[PDB]
Amino acid sequence: GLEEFFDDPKNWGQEKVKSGAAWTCQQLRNKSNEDLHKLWYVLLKERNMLLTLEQEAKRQRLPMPSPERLDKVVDSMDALDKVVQEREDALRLLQTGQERARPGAWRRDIFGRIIWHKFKQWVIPWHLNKRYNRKRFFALPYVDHFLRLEREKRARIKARKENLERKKAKILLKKF
């Protein structure tokens, strides 16, 4: 129930609730899938409790008892997500040989930049799709000058960063 959104009533106002170390990614790799599913839900209920407590601390203009608990539960579930995604990535690379889960393509644009178009899910094919054929994956010849000017600006910024690098080095060698 909602008593699981709140803490233990004996911890209310205890100014510090001790804790334990966040789950390390190697330990989560040692555990199996089903246990990682169940631990995901255990950690989810703990994170909901901690977020509820932090918002009520803000409401009452009092410090949260121990925010390290919220930080460590976020790290624990990030590590769990990492472990499960590594296992799926390994199986996908083994079975299909594809290194991404979503299809996509390197394409050009109406602006002449090369982008990674991530694919969308459709029911009709692309030649019959209206909106898709309204989009332009090609740059007509009036984009090349703006591409050249964009490259030149990037060169003007890099040359500045590297000259300052050398000026700063000489000022350091002036002092020491």
Binding site: F6, E56, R59, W122
Partner: protein, 102 residues
């Protein structure tokens, strides 16, 4: 339901959309105004549907839920920093869950 993930398209006659590890995280919030006795107020993500808050609260917390209503609360963009650039307080979803079985 989950955030920031592509959903598999459903074509009629297809399997149930099942989520296994949801990244939906909610906060129970004290109501600012007076509410009835059956009302529990939550702060939920923008991409969480009232059908999914009901399913979330009845699957993970085993809370019988009779009604769910939601609204979108706007955060202020009025505040400005030292550069006169407006600072945006975020937008969130508020949900009012009316419990079941009295």
């Amino acid at each position: 339901m989950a955030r920031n993930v592509v959903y598999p398209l459903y074509r009629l006659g297809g399997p149930q959309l099942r989520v296994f590890r949801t990244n939906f995280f909610i906060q129970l919030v004290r109501p600012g105004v007076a509410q009835p006795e059956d009302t529990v107020q939550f702060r939920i993500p923008m991409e969480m549907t009232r059908v999914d808050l009901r399913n979330y609260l009845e699957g993970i917390y085993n809370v019988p839920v009779a009604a769910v209503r939601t609204r979108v609360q706007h955060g202020s963009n009025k505040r400005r920093d030292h550069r006169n650039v407006r600072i945006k307080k975020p937008d969130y979803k508020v949900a009012y869950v009316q419990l079941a079985h009295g």
